[PDB]
Design a protein around this ligand. Structure first.
Ligand SMILES: [Mg+2]
Ligand SMILES: [Mg+2]
Ligand SMILES: [Mg+2]
Ligand SMILES: [Zn+2]
Lengths: 100, 221, 66, 140
RNA sequence: UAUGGUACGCAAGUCUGAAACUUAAAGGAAUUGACGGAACAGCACACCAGAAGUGGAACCUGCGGCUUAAUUUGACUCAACAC
């Protein structure tokens, strides 16, 4: 019972692909296999934002607080446990560009 | 409290070199002279990391350009500084980094006639023309060979524009948008590029400044 | 800091809280310092449309429900 | 009276700029002010200073207490505004700043401290030495 | 695996490679259940806003122990125990 046709990794036309340590655990995982999400968040709770934007010395800031950039790479055990990815029915299992 | 730990500390106002505002930007702390320790001489090598908070008119939009300065001189309770480095905020970088285009990077080593050896890193990105939203479908990559020609060209041009200018000149040009314009004009044949950037500048080998040239660097209007 | 604003509910929007004990609500202000401003607030207790609410901060605005 | 061994000549218009290096770990938080050079250190506060429990070292309560101590101490050095340089342990380790990050940043301004330019400097390998985990990471 | 290798290897071992004996199953995909220290979604005074409280006391009345000649006996999570 082959489960995935992909077999989980996006890799074809090569023998080997570089291994990446998982953010959460640090387990080595295939770069194709890895669940990788790029995150641009803000360093600060919106309330906290109000508080700081009051006190910003340079008034020449328009959204003059930096965003936090993360390239997040999960091993499978981790990205499942941590709900980044979750179990779906056989038919949906092949759906490719899902979010909102 | 008993004996505030800063009891012995003298303060100095930083002064910026010729491309920047003559007005002091920050202030620094140092311990008083001990009769061995000479107050002014403990500061000979210090390094200042600032934005352009340093160009009064033009500053406010560029929080993206970091400038390192090094203190060449102490004059009368205020510390003069010469050029040390150029750089970029994390933000202004990961700002520019997008999937589905090619990331070009170009490193160069150059000499001023001022006697400086500099290392300039340049950054550039593939510019999509085709008018869609760049995506998994909208792939923008440029051929590796085109990348190589782009390096060769950028690099060459910089070494040329370096050898003919003083470090005052060179730094002024470097901070601002001149080189980006020119670089796009050279590069465009090979491939259209977007947000050309000078990622960093390092100063490899710096001569010491005669009183003359350090006066001519100061030269403020 | 004591400063206070009267807030009248235009719409009852959601229902929310871990136990589900709170109501989400849309609000028009009557203070006179800020009039006709609209806000989204989380209210504990039972509310209809067109109640009045005593609000200590018109800056805190509640995260909408999805 | 008050002898502040901070800077000689100020005004009410003037801004006095210190720099705050803030390190947030899953295990602790650091609020550290220096001059624009980074050489001369002004104030130093760790979470562990502010709590006796090893586990609370990182927490927001600790970060808060830390922050207010720092602020109180800059205030007498006549310092209005800190630039902020934020850091997680970084390098090969995690790049997500710890819990104390936000809390300390807030409590700093909450305390009536102006806030200058903000940058994240977290150490970022072009490439890495090998990670402290197993080949298989932390199991459990 | 045993054994034989004018097959290899410094070694680890690699390659070649049995039979006696024993056994009716082992095995493949898929269905339905049941289960899960997986994901999601319902419903109930389950929890939530509350109240009256038991648990603490004396006593009453059940269980269990323990004594007893005998302390008849069934019934132990809701789903035994003023049954
Ligand atoms: Mg292989
Ligand atoms: Mg194409
Ligand atoms: Mg570890
Ligand atoms: Zn993991």
């Amino acid at each position: 019972p082959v489960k995935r046709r992909n077999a989980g990794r996006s890799q074809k036309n090569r023998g080997h692909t570089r291994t990446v340590p998982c953010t959460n655990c640090g387990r080595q995982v295939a770069k194709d296999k890895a669940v990788k999400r790029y995150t641009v968040r803000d360093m600060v709770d919106p309330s906290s934002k109000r508080d700081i934007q009051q006190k910003l010395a340079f008034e020449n800031e328009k959204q003059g607080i930096p965003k936090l950039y993360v390239k997040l790479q999960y091993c499978i055990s981790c990205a499942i446990h941590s709900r980044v990815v979750r179990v779906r029915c056989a038919e949906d299992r092949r759906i490719r560009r899902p979010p909102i | 409290r008993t004996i505030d730990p800063l009891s012995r500390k003298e303060w100095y106002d930083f002064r910026a070199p010729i491309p920047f505002s003559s007005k002091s930007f920050g202030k620094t702390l140092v311990t008083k002279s001990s009769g061995n320790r000479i107050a002014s001489e403990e500061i000979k090598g210090r390094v200042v990391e600032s934005t352009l908070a340093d160009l009064k008119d033009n500053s406010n939009d560029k929080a993206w350009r970091k400038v390192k300065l090094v203190i060449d001189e102490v004059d009368g309770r205020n510390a003069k500084t010469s050029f040390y480095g150029l750089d970029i905020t994390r933000d202004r970088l990961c700002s520019m980094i997008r999937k589905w285009q090619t990331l070009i990077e170009a490193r160069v080593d150059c000499k001023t006639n001022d006697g400086y050896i500099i290392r300039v890193f340049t950054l550039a990105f593939t510019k999509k023309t085709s008018a869609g939203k760049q995506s998994s479908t909208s792939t923008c990559y440029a051929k590796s060979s085109q990348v190589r020609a782009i390096r060769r060209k950028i690099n060459t041009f910089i070494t040329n524009e370096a050898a003919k200018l003083g470090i005052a000149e060179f730094s002024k040009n470097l901070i601002g948008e001149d080189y980006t314009k020119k670089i796009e004009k050279e590069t465009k044949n090979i491939f259209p590029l977007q947000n050309i950037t000078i990622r960093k500048v390092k100063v490899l080998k710096r001569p010491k400044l005669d009183a003359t040239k350090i006066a001519e660097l100061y030269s403020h209007e | 800091t004591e400063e206070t604003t009267k807030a009248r509910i235009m719409d009852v929007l959601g229902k929310t809280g871990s136990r589900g004990g709170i109501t989400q609500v849309r609000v028009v202000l009557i203070s006179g310092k800020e009039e006709g401003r609209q806000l989204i607030r989380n209210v504990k207790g039972a509310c209809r449309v067109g109640d009045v609410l005593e609000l200590m901060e018109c800056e805190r605005e509640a995260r909408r429900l999805r | 009276e008050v002898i502040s061994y901070g800077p000689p000549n100020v005004g009410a218009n003037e801004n006095v700029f210190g720099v705050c290096h803030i390190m947030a770990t899953w295990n602790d938080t650091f609020i550290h002010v220096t001059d624009l050079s980074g050489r001369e250190t002004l104030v130093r506060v760790t979470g562990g200073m502010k709590v006796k429990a090893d586990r609370e070292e990182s927490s927001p309560y600790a970060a808060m207490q830390a922050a207010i101590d720092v602020v109180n101490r800059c205030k007498e050095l006549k310092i209005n505004a800190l630039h902020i340089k934020l850091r997680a342990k970084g390098g090969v380790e995690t790049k997500q700043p710890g819990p104390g990050a936000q809390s300390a940043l807030r409590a700093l301004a909450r305390s009536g401290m102006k806030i200058g330019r903000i940058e994240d400097v977290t150490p970022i390998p072009t490439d890495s030495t090998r990670r402290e985990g197993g080949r298989r990471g932390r199991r459990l």
